[PDB]
Amino acid sequence: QAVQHVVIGPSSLIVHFNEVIGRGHFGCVYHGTLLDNDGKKIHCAVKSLNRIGEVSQFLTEGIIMKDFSHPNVLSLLGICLRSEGSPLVVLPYMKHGDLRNFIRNETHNPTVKDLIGFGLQVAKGMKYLASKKFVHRDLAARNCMLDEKFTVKVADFGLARDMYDKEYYSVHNKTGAKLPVKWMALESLQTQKFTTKSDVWSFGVLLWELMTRGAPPYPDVNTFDITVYLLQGRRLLQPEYCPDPLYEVMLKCWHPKAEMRPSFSELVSRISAIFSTF
Ligand SMILES: O=[N+]([O-])c1cccc(CNc2nc(C(F)(F)F)nc3ncc(-c4cnn(C5CCNCC5)c4)cc23)c1
């Protein structure tokens, strides 16, 4: 026990295994139905982890993840160990899928204000995580979800940590770490260490993705050259319809001196002000 408050009884959960809605390196994600305490049926997303010594680490992870709670951070609904043996991670269903795919979709019409609002939401989610001394390491539009109410959830963390799109990652050959090179702070490219200050660099990249509606960053600088491009002081350019003040905020996030970058509390303030004016 001690993980009992995280536990979901098997007969209280249906996983719709024919309906794959996501795939990461650590397992598939399926549509599911959970019967809550209320006795109401709710839509969930279920994560099937394929890959006994490491079982107790999973229960360990479930409880710490359960303690995190915020409107803009992905929440853990529960975990279900079945007779199958494959641990199941139960998370709320995100109607609009990941934020990058939502904005790239040409049939969607998010407004400039919408896009700035998504950004603010992440800033808020990230503010809460940095206060709990949590470093994300992989903040990006592809790793934020969008629910039915246009609420952004910072995901890719705890039991949901994975690679869902291999395309942008280098996997280090010695340490195993995923390295999303084009979202990485300069100092992270050099030392492979990550901080809240490097999260801030990445949030900057995320804002740029928002104001370009999911364009690939630095499409013409190869991976290797990214380090000298940044050492040369060069940075991503202002997208066409990105307000001047917001771009200034991006540039702040990319200052070569980590200490010189704003904190997420400071980013929430500047961006709320931008969001509310005009
Ligand atoms: O953990 N992540 O940050 C992450 C990032 C990218 C992909 C995933 C796996 N995809 C997912 N992970 C989760 C989570 F994290 F809560 F379990 N919840 C999810 N809810 C809904 C959907 C989904 C898939 N298609 N759609 C609709 C898109 C518009 N039309 C058709 C259906 C929604 C994908 C999820 C996870």
Swiss-Prot record:
Changing D162H has the effect of: In RCCP; somatic mutation
Describe which stretch of the whole protein the shown chain covers, with first residue, last residue and complete length. Answer: 1064 to 1344 of 1390
Q: Which organism is it from?
A: Homo sapiens (Human)
Query: Which portions of the sequence form the region Interaction with RANBP9?
Result: 146-278
Phosphothreonine PTM positions read T223
Classification from the root reads: Eukaryota, Metazoa, Chordata, Craniata, Vertebrata
- Family recorded in the similarity comment: Belongs to the protein kinase superfamily. Tyr protein kinase family.
Recorded protein name is Hepatocyte growth factor receptor
Tell me what the record says results from Y247F.
Answer: No effect on ligand-induced CBL-mediated ubiquitination
Give the result of M65T, as annotated.
In RCCP; germline mutation
- Give the subcellular location: Membrane
The UniProt entry annotates the active site at D138
Q: Which residues lie on this side of the membrane: Cytoplasmic?
A: 1-278
UniProt lists the gene as: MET
Q: Which residues carry this modification: Phosphotyrosine?
A: Y164, Y168, Y169
